[PDB]
Every structure is written in structure tokens, then in C-alpha cells.
């Protein structure tokens, strides 16, 4: 219904967006290592539906 501002920080850079996010009740980042390196960290964005 209203515009929203999103700022996230993954392992590489920053993402700042201003859009119409349909945020869920509990936005979050699913976070998991890789099987061999474990040096960087892979993220799945569960912040907004659309």
C-alpha cells in the first residue's frame, strides 16, 4: 500500500532499493555455508513476497 526502503548487506556488497515491497511478518535471510570452502556465506532472501 505504501513505498518502502530496503537495505541489506550480503557477503559481497550492499543492496539499497526503494520499491513497493509486500513484506511478510518475519523478513529474514536464510544463511548457509558451502560444503568445502566455508569462507563466504550464501544467503537466501526471504524478506518480501513481491
Amino acid at each position, epitope marked *: *500500500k505504501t513505498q518502502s526502503l530496503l537495505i541489506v548487506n550480503n557477503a559481497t556488497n550492499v543492496v539499497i532499493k526503494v520499491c513497493e515491497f509486500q513484506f511478510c511478518n518475519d523478513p529474514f535471510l536464510g544463511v548457509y555455508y558451502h560444503k568445502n570452502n566455508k569462507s563466504w556465506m550464501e544467503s537466501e532472501f526471504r524478506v518480501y513476497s513481491s
Partner: nanobody
Amino acid sequence: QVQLQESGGGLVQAGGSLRLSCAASGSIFSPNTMGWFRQALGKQREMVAVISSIASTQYANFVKGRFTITRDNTKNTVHLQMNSLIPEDTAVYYCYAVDKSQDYWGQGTQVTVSS
């Protein structure tokens, strides 16, 4: 170019029912207010009804309890359900996209009622 699509008017005998529709596409920024406006040949733009994003409904005294507006959040569209027609309602209508900056306007729908 925000465009408002109007449909669903025409010729109906006294006592009939119709359903107008305005679909506003383009920018249509978030806190939008959608209205419906009346004009018969020789008169001015008569404010029929008004809806905000709050879902509140505002209607005039002219046609008390006979127009209804329906909201579609998924497509953000609007429908007029006009029931119990009377030949004083014979006037073309336009929809008013308030938006937040550049208020838009419709192309019109002819609504005609007589016997």
C-alpha cells in the same frame, strides 16, 4: 503515461443494474484516491463517490444508497455497481485518479436510463 480504462455502461431501462469499471495502470503511486464523477449535458462534474486506500467510502446525497464501489487490491482496480436506475442518473461518468501528484482523468462511459 498512467491510463484509466473505463467500461460497462450503456442503455438500460428504468430499474435495471450495471457495473462500470476503471482500471488505472502505469505509475499510480501508492496512496491513491479513486473517484467517480457525473456530467449530464448542460451541467457540471458532479462528484458521485470517492475512495481512498483506507478503504473508506464516501457518497453524495443525490443517489443515496444506490451506487456501490468495489475494490480490487490485486489489480488495484475499481467497479461501480449501480442498482435501482432512475432517469435522473442519465449522465456520462468519469473516474478521478488522484495519485499523489498528477491527477488523471477518464475517457467516459455513457449511462442512459429512460422509458
